[PDB]
Amino acid sequence: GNVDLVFLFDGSMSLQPDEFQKILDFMKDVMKKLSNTSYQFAAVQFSTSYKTEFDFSDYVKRKDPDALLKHVKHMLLLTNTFGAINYVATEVFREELGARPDATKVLIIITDGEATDSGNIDAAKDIIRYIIGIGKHFQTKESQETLHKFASKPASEFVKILDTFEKLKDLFTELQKKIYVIE
Amino acid sequence: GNVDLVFLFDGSMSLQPDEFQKILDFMKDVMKKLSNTSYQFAAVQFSTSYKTEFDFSDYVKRKDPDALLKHVKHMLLLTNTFGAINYVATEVFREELGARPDATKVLIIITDGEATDSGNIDAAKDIIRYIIGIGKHFQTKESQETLHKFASKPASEFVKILDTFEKLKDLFTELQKKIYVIE
Ligand SMILES: [Cl-]
Ligand SMILES: [Cl-]
Ligand SMILES: [Mg+2]
Ligand SMILES: [Mg+2]
Numbered sequence: 001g002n003v004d005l006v007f008l009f010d011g012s013m014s015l016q017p018d019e020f021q022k023i024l025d026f027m028k029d030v031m032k033k034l035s036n037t038s039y040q041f042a043a044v045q046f047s048t049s050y051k052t053e054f055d056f057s058d059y060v061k062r063k064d065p066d067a068l069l070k071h072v073k074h075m076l077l078l079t080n081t082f083g084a085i086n087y088v089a090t091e092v093f094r095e096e097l098g099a100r101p102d103a104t105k106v107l108i109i110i111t112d113g114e115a116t117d118s119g120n121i122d123a124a125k126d127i128i129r130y131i132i133g134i135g136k137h138f139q140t141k142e143s144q145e146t147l148h149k150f151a152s153k154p155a156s157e158f159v160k161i162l163d164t165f166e167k168l169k170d171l172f173t174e175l176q177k178k179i180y181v182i183e
Numbered sequence: 184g185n186v187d188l189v190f191l192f193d194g195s196m197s198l199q200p201d202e203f204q205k206i207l208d209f210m211k212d213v214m215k216k217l218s219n220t221s222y223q224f225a226a227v228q229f230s231t232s233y234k235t236e237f238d239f240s241d242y243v244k245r246k247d248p249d250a251l252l253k254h255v256k257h258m259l260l261l262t263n264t265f266g267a268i269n270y271v272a273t274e275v276f277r278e279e280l281g282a283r284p285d286a287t288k289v290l291i292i293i294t295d296g297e298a299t300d301s302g303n304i305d306a307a308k309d310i311i312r313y314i315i316g317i318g319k320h321f322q323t324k325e326s327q328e329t330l331h332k333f334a335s336k337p338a339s340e341f342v343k344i345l346d347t348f349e350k351l352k353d354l355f356t357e358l359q360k361k362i363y364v365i366e
Contacts, residue, residue, distance in 0.1 A: 034364075037360060038360045038362075157366060173219065176220050177219075177220055178220075178365045178366075179221075179364055179365075180186070180221075180363065181358055183340065183361075
């Protein structure tokens with residue numbers, strides 16, 4: 001059926017210009033591949049606070065991915081992941097913002113560091129949540145587990161750990177192998 | 184998993200140059216949208232006889248549909264669909280020709296007239312068969328009924344009827360709404 005997918009990307013102080021660009025490229029690639037499908041998209045940059053770069057209505061109005069993200073500016077601040085996730089659940093997934101009523105909700109969280117805040121993401125528990133942890137900040141198994149709480153279960157399918165930002169290209173390659181025209 | 188898909192397109196005398204071109208456009212549109220996935224394609228033109236325009240190996244070596252179908256010459260003869268389907272079953276789905284051993288076999292038959300031969304397609308029965316009947320030759324319930332024996336069950340799912348070749352543009356729009364990234 002319909003799929004309303006939200007990209008919640010890390011814009012923290014740790015990211016180098018090229019790394020931030022690779023995150024933007026990844027989001028665009030998936031969007032272009034899935035253009036003219038039953039998917040609709042929204043994008044929110046998060047660091048200390050949260051900013052919807054374009055919401056569902058924006059995408060519907062102008063499907064152009066490159067145009068939708070041409071205005072993004074790297075925040076360069078903290079990594080308040082609990083707040084960011086709750087922000088999507090209540091401020092982005094809204095009918096008035098273009099979200100479709102009984103559409104399946106999906107969240108693709110991309111981050112390069114552990115969350116600097118805490119609390120709960122209970123309000124977002126019914127959204128299908130994928131998280132992509134990139135870079136040396138996720139070298140240890142300990143740091144990787146910290147991401148499970150944000151993603152759906154099992155972690156084996158929903159939590160993806162990438163050692164480099166270059167690997168985002170590999171991940172896109174792999175996701176395309178999972179694309180099918182369903183009966 | 185892996186999907187080996189063969190397009191079997193009508194090259195009969197009834198087809199005008201632009202109608203035959205729209206059939207090719209449909210095939211290329213499909214292939215382009217499904218590029219870099221688990222799908223691999225082969226295309227066979229049929230009329231009085233049959234011709235593999237490019238096989239699975241060719242597709243793999245040069246994944247460019249436009250380049251893959253640039254030499255196609257409209258046969259302009261009859262409509263031997265029974266023989267054509269049997270040819271795909273035994274002359275196209277072959278490992279030496281690029282087909283992957285246990286990939287799901289799918290056949291997309293595109294035609295604008297009733298078969299001019301007879302027999303059976305028992306040898307192609309394990310292949311998921313879709314048939315697209317286009318135009319004035321299918322304006323009666325009887326003519327449309329004859330297409331059923333070539334496709335998988337139920338006909339309501341595997342038989343597609345288009346009043347015009349223009350409609351192949353519509354059909355492609357429709358099928359894209361069924362494109363999802365599987366878990
Ligand atoms: Cl950081
Ligand atoms: Cl004909
Ligand atoms: Mg960071
Ligand atoms: Mg014909």
